[PDB]
Design an enzyme around this catalytic site. Structure first.
Site: not given
Ligand SMILES: C=CC[C@H](C(=O)N1CCCC[C@H]1C(=O)O[C@H](CCc1ccc(OC)c(OC)c1)c1cccc(OCC(=O)O)c1)c1cc(OC)c(OC)c(OC)c1
Ligand code: NA
Length: 128
Positions: A45, A118, A75, A55-56, A101
Site C-alpha cells: 500500500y 490509501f 484502523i 505520505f506513507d 484516528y
Molecule cells: C497515511 C497513513 C498513516 C499510516 C496508517 O494510518 N495506516 C498504516 C497502514 C494500515 C492502515 C493505517 C493503520 O492502521 O495504521 C496502524 C497504526 C496503529 C494502530 C492500530 C490499530 C488501531 O486501532 C484498532 C490504532 O488506533 C490508534 C492504531 C498500523 C501501522 C503499522 C502497522 C500496523 O499493523 C501491522 C503491523 O503492526 O505490522 C498498523 C501509518 C503508518 C505507520 O507506520 C508505517 C504508522 O506507525 C508510525 C502509523 O501510526 C499512526 C500510521
C-alpha cells in the site's frame, strides 16, 4: 485526483451508510473469495492525508504489510475495506476520521479529525 474520484464515484462500504469508508476498485483481482475475520492478509500500500501531507511508502512494493483481518490490528476503515478485496485487487480507499484516528488523531503524525487516502493491493490471504 484520486481522492476526488473516490468522493464522486466511490462505493460506500460502511454498515451505517455514512460515507465513512469509500472504495473504488482500480484493478480487478482473481476469483471470487475475499478474506474472513481472522485470516492473515498480505498487502502492499501507500497512503496519505487526503490533502497530500504525511505520505506513507513504508510498504509500497518492498516487504509486505501483514495483519490478521478483523482483529483491530489496523484502523476500522482497513478491517472494513481490505475484507472486500480479492487476491490481486488494487483499490483506492477514502477514510473519514471516525473510521481512522478520530478526534484524537495520532499526534504529531496524524492530526485531529483527519481524512486518509490509501492505494491498497491485496497480495494474498490465508486462514488462521
Ligand atoms: C497515511 C497513513 C498513516 C499510516 C496508517 O494510518 N495506516 C498504516 C497502514 C494500515 C492502515 C493505517 C493503520 O492502521 O495504521 C496502524 C497504526 C496503529 C494502530 C492500530 C490499530 C488501531 O486501532 C484498532 C490504532 O488506533 C490508534 C492504531 C498500523 C501501522 C503499522 C502497522 C500496523 O499493523 C501491522 C503491523 O503492526 O505490522 C498498523 C501509518 C503508518 C505507520 O507506520 C508505517 C504508522 O506507525 C508510525 C502509523 O501510526 C499512526 C500510521
Ligand atoms: Na506472519
Amino acid at each position: 485526483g484520486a481522492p476526488a474520484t473516490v468522493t464522486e464515484q466511490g462505493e460506500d462500504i460502511t454498515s451505517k451508510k455514512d460515507r465513512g469508508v469509500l472504495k473504488i476498485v482500480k484493478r480487478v483481482g482473481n476469483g471470487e473469495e475475499t478474506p474472513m475475520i481472522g485470516d492473515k492478509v498480505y498487502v502492499h500500500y501507500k497512503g496519505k492525508l487526503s490533502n497530500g501531507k504525511k505520505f506513507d511508502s513504508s510498504h509500497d512494493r518492498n516487504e509486505p504489510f501483514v495483519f490478521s483481518l478483523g482483529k483491530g490490528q489496523v484502523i476500522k476503515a482497513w478491517d472494513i475495506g481490505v475484507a472486500t478485496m480479492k487476491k490481486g485487487e488494487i483499490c483506492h480507499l477514502l477514510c473519514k476520521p471516525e473510521y481512522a484516528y478520530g478526534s484524537a488523531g495520532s499526534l504529531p503524525k496524524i492530526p485531529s479529525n483527519a481524512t486518509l487516502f490509501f492505494e491498497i493491493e491485496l497480495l494474498d490471504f490465508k486462514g488462521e
